[PDB]
Design a protein around this nucleic acid. Sequence first.
RNA 1: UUUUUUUUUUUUUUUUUUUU
RNA 2: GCUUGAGUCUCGUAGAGGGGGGUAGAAUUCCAGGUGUAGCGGUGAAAUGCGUAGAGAUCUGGAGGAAUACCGGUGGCGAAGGCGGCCCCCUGGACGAAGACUGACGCUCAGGUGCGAAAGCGUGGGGAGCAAACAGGAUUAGAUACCCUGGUAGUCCACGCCGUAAACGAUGUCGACUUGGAGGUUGUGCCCUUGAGGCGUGGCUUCCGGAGCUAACGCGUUAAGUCGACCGCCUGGGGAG
Lengths: 88, 267, 100, 55, 129, 51
Amino acid sequence: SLSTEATAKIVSEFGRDANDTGSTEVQVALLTAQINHLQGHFAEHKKDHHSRRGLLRMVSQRRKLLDYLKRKDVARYTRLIERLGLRR
Amino acid sequence: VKCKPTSPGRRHVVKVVNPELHKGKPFAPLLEKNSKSGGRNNNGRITTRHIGGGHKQAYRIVDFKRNKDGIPAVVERLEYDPNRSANIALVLYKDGERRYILAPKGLKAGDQIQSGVDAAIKPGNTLPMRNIPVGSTVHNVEMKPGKGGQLARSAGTYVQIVARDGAYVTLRLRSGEMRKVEADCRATLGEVGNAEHMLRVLGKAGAARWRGVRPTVRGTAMNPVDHPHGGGEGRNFGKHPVTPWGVQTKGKKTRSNKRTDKFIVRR
Amino acid sequence: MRHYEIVFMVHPDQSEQVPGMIERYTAAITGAEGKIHRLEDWGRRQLAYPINKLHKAHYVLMNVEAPQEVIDELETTFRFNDAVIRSMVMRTKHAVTEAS
Amino acid sequence: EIDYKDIATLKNYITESGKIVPSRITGTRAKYQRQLARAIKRARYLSLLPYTDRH
Amino acid sequence: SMQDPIADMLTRIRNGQAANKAAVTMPSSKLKVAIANVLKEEGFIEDFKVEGDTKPELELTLKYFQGKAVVESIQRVSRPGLRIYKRKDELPKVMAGLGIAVVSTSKGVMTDRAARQAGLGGEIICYVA
Amino acid sequence: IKVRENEPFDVALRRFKRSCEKAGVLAEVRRREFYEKPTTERKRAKASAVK
RNA sequence: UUUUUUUUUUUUUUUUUUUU
RNA sequence: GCUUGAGUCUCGUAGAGGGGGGUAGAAUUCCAGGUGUAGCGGUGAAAUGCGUAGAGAUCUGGAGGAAUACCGGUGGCGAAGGCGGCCCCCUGGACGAAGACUGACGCUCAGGUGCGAAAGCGUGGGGAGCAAACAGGAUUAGAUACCCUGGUAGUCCACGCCGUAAACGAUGUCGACUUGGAGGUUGUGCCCUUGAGGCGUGGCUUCCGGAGCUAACGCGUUAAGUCGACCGCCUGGGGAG
């Protein structure tokens, strides 16, 4: 929902060698920048609940893909949180 | 009370749940341009307006006329007025001056205040109705076309511009919608400022009706030295009108100057 | 740039007012940078129903590649115009560029 | 038949009660009929297909 | 079928074998191919084959006698968690002596008879009769 | 819904408006309409007509 | 799929055994 | 280690839109005055108003209240409900696809979370036309009535405790089920597209087919015949909601 100024910068920062753009630390950096962008414009339209369940569903996934990553790969998980916080 | 900020009364913890709880609308000093209202009734001599108790009136807001039209302006604050329940606000005009204006609900930002012949349609001081569109809200209405504001307050009395009615003879209002007055009168827009102070009871009492006056409380009941009734023994029981002048329907008017009412469907 | 197919009806006999009044409607469309696929003087044509009593209109149609920021302004400056009988707006499923 | 210049030539499908007849009579493919239906709709509301006798 | 490993093995030999076929074919599984084997070697089916060896399919020649299913009187009795482990003399002895059942235990899948004679209890897969 | 007669010897050419507008419009409305129960009835009638 | 030409008419007691 | 259950991108495609917005159009009241004179509504039969202070209607001039009449369907969507014109914004669900990226992050749920048809509480009203109550004229074995003019509430609802009953495969979760064959529809691969669709083929839906199962109607594989993960309800009269 944000621009390719931030999202090429997410791929550069959270990838590891080649084609990582949809990989687990890139998808979670994605989803934490995308919420944090939607949190900038959700301030508008005043009746916006048509929109909102997206923002809500994608934060429940951010929490969930973290619950998964801990179990899968403890290095991946623990190095991710010192860049993005998100343990919530 | 269903608007926001609604400001609700407390829990039942004390004798006063209401009055109004609004933060952010009393300030001091009473700023340079002000005045008061004088003594008790003193009409000269045998006073006709009953029960009195007339101390502490007290201060009023000195801005009428308000004809400062096309000089643009901006908004420092909004306040209260306890004489009218009103949402009155501090308007700095960009020539070099500060006023007190009868503004609607949340007209601050500090906004884009400006009015007059053709120049604007915006939030606007006092605005001639012949120059501007149709709408529901109007407010000021110069009561006859050069006199001044019919409504000094934004208390919900929606007076409503109709479009092409009768050559400029607009407004669709409260007790007689064929009031028929010319669109050469001035509006402001609009009539909802403080709903909250008047959509609910302030008190049984509160300060508004005991620290500086008495309201009505009696006329008929007790002592026959006044009204046409009624013996004693707690009985009364009779035919007792409001003499010589009548009550629960009759009308009072025949003739007067203006007297433009034209249909007045009553009820 | 929605492809607004907009039909507007002005007063029938004002053949001298309308050539310039299209210039006073297009002036909102160029402002937008939006653009005219077709723009039709339909003439003094008769009416389906008795609206605004002179039993004809001066019909104008256009097909504008213009954004949503103009159409409530257009709607207003047709509606506030006491010479405008009725005015209506269709949109999208490509552009029309062929006359009627 | 999606747009204007063809429906001014197809007013044959208007029966005398002033309405658009069910295609039993010629037998058209669904895509083409469902195109012409929307070409007709824009021509209705714009009076370029001037629906029944007095309008 | 994954909610009950390996139960569909007993339903599929009922279905196809009622339904006019001399044949049925499916993906293989950790108990099914031993069941296929015992069903032939007792003779309740005519053959079985297994095919695509490196990731194989499992194929049984059903016994379409009179157009009715041989495995019409069948029941798969042991279910998820609520297992049926029975001692070497608690085992099935059904149809007044004519038998039989198919089990699994400490030597593979086998008939209840061949289990009783090896002197072992086990997992009661199905009452074949 | 507007229909001439010519030479008018009481011609009675006025007859073709029975197609819908004059004559068919009474399906709903008579005093009174039907109000409840006419909606699935329109498509119920499609089955009585198969002959 | 509009279906008010008047509203009502007390309890009984009939009752050809039986296993098949 | 995989079968990729699960998603986020990429890329497309329409309708009676979850919430705020803009709002297109018959009748017809009753009036300013333009008229024809006595008759207009109403019924199993007519009535109380009414009529030389003219029964409507019908023009012209005006003041108010604001359904969706249909390309509208021999139909379209939807979790139910439940909207009928079209549009601007928030842009539900989806879900037809070159794929990319991670490998069960999964299904299905009780207490709760939301939603919640009838109805009361509203708090202030938006105050057509019809019609419970309202108000009678009338048909009178009593009508405490149904008419017929007159009549509100229901129309709908900002906003929110709403349980809730007829929202029944008298019925969830579903994967394997591959005799099937016939329609009703939707999207789509391939054709000298001489073509009413030929060869195909999923989805949405219905039709209604053996071995079995089996009373009587017949139901005949996804359907009750196999196989199963539970969050359940199931304690007999009358005691009861």
